[PDB]
């Protein structure tokens, strides 16, 4: 099914969540 | 193969014991390192790539994204397109998951969650629109792309957004600054917070999720 | 079995425009 998986690359709900979580974090580190 | 799976599941279990609180999740300084380490692990876990996002994760993100444990300068939230689109997607998952599980006072709790969801969703979109209009120059590329994905299609709002899109800075700021007072963020924080807790309650009462609503339940028997 | 729990009886959840 998956090209990403076969190449051993990050993708999916948890990885998208990780990125978004960090985005909010770094924003709030000064705010 | 599944040594990675047994690991990831335990990390997911651990997050669950940090993310499921009675009231909303906020990332406290004493939790943040382990909460970060867990998310990162699951983010790069090969075996998690096609696993369903559990509803506690989506809830905890929404709580954290919209700073729901407060009651709001409007400006603790990052109003970036890439993030808020995904935030709406995750919010959409919670509502679908709620609807699906509900089929298997219940009328009131279902109907309120419906009304609250749409109200919150609309508010998120309206405040996303507000941020898009404050750009100089305006990111029409993502702005119109957003309006296809999220936000309904009425000639009225479609053209009114377009009309206002071609006005300038001080007038664009004025329409927003008037409408932010006419539609305050405190209204939606309330709504979104009540939705999340309304949702939490249904799923523990009926579907037997455990969202620490045990104390809330017994106070409704009395 | 109330008709209000999380929403106040008279509350405007209608967002315009
Ligand atoms: Zn894959």
């Amino acid at each position: 099914a998956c090209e990403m998986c076969r190449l051993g690359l990050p993708h999916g709900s948890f990885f998208e969540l990780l990125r978004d979580w960090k985005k909010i974090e770094e924003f709030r580190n000064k705010s | 193969g599944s040594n990675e799976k047994i690991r990831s599941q335990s990390v997911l279990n651990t997050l669950e014991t940090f993310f499921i609180k009675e009231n909303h999740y906020d990332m406290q300084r004493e939790e943040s390192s382990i909460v970060n380490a867990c998310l990162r692990y699951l983010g790069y876990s090969k075996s998690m790539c096609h696993e369903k996002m559990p509803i506690f994760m989506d809830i905890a993100f929404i709580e954290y994204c919209f700073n729901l444990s407060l009651d709001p300068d409007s400006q603790q939230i990052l109003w970036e397109y890439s993030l808020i689109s995904n935030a709406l997607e995750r919010l959409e998952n919670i509502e679908l998951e709620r609807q699906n599980c509900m089929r298997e006072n219940k009328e009131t709790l279902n109907n309120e969650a419906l009304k609250l969801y749409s109200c919150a969703k609309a508010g998120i979109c309206r405040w996303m629109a507000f941020h898009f209009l404050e750009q100089e120059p305006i990111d029409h590329i993502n702005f119109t792309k957003f309006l296809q994905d999220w936000g309904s299609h009425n000639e009225k709002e479609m053209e009114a957004l377009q009309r206002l899109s071609k006005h300038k800075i001080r007038k664009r700021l004025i329409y927003v600054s008037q409408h932010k007072k006419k539609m305050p963020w405190s209204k939606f924080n309330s709504v979104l917070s009540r939705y999340i807790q309304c949702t939490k309650l249904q799923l523990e009462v009926f579907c037997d999720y455990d969202f620490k609503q045990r104390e809330i339940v017994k106070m409704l028997t009395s | 079995n109330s008709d209000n729990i999380f929403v106040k009886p008279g509350e405007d959840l209608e967002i315009p425009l």
Side-chain angles (χ1 to χ4, degrees):
Chain A
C2 197
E3 197 190 341
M4 291 273 207
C5 292
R6 209 130 60 189
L7 289 170
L9 288 166
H11 61 294
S13 296
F14 295 90
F15 181 61
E16 294 319 311
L17 189 85
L18 166 66
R19 288 162 73 174
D20 295 357
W21 198 277
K22 304 264 104 182
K23 274 201 215 159
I24 299 160
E25 276 183 352
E26 68 155 305
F27 174 75
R28 284 187 184 147
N29 287 355
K30 262 230 75 214
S31 272
Chain B
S2 65
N3 292 137
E4 168 77 281
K5 266 272 193 156
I6 291 153
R7 268 193 272 272
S8 308
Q9 261 278 178
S10 195
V11 172
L12 195 59
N13 287 342
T14 297
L15 273 169
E16 204 202 39
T17 66
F18 281 83
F19 276 8
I20 298 182
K21 319 262 212 213
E22 186 171 30
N23 289 304
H24 307 306
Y25 177 84
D26 180 35
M27 192 178 74
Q28 315 305 345
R29 229 100 72 102
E30 305 166 316
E31 294 170 20
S32 55
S33 169
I34 184 132
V35 169
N36 285 338
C38 283
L39 296 166
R40 208 203 183 275
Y41 188 85
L42 296 185
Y44 291 87
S45 181
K46 225 150 280 174
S47 73
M48 295 306 272
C49 286
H50 299 291
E51 217 64 16
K52 195 191 159 289
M53 186 64 99
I55 219 60
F56 87 84
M57 295 281 276
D58 282 322
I59 286 162
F61 171 86
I62 288 300
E63 292 171 338
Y64 183 63
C65 184
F66 298 104
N67 200 89
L68 292 185
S69 48
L70 225 74
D71 278 46
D73 298 303
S74 84
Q75 285 143 338
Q76 203 70 55
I77 300 139
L78 176 64
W79 294 97
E80 183 189 304
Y81 161 71
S82 175
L83 165 72
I84 297 284
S85 167
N86 300 347
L88 286 150
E89 287 187 55
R90 295 187 187 95
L91 193 70
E92 200 189 67
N93 302 345
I94 306 157
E95 181 45 41
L96 293 187
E97 189 78 75
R98 191 198 65 75
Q99 282 185 115
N100 276 286
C101 296
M102 279 290 96
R103 294 187 140 184
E104 305 145 67
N105 59 0
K106 188 176 166 159
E107 287 170 62
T108 326
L109 286 181
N110 197 97
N111 295 328
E112 284 176 304
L114 279 150
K115 290 162 191 182
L116 286 157
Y117 173 83
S118 315
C119 189
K121 188 183 171 183
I124 291 157
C125 295
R126 207 147 309 281
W127 278 79
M128 228 308 143
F130 293 155
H131 177 275
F132 268 130
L133 298 155
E134 284 172 294
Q135 255 77 258
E136 200 215 304
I138 299 155
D139 197 334
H140 275 96
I141 317 140
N142 291 308
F143 185 28
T144 327
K145 160 75 179 175
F146 174 77
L147 287 155
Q148 289 162 248
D149 285 293
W150 304 108
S152 69
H153 309 270
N154 271 38
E155 274 183 59
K156 304 207 174 208
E157 62 178 327
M158 293 272 273
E159 288 174 324
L161 286 158
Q162 284 167 354
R163 279 174 174 180
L164 197 82
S165 209
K166 289 164 213 170
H167 294 314
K168 211 66 81 181
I169 310 138
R170 278 190 181 181
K171 287 177 176 177
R172 287 193 271 118
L173 295 164
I174 278 160
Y175 185 90
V176 167
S177 196
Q178 286 170 306
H179 275 255
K180 280 185 174 179
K181 291 200 164 180
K182 291 156 184 178
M183 228 74 209
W185 183 247
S186 63
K187 193 188 206 280
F188 301 122
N189 181 253
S190 164
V191 169
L192 197 46
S193 185
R194 275 142 71 218
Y195 168 72
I196 286 295
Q197 296 183 150
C198 176
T199 304
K200 275 185 189 162
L201 183 57
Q202 289 160 73
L203 299 174
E204 181 154 345
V205 169
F206 304 108
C207 316
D208 203 80
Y209 286 73
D210 184 40
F211 285 110
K212 294 176 163 183
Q213 309 287 306
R214 215 226 147 215
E215 203 73 4
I216 309 283
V217 165
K218 58 189 258 76
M219 293 326 300
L220 293 161
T221 315
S222 185
Chain C
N1 293 264
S2 301
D3 296 310
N4 289 114
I5 296 161
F6 280 96
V7 189
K8 296 163 175 185
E11 196 189 342
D12 192 45
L13 300 172
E14 200 197 315
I15 324 300
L17 193 136

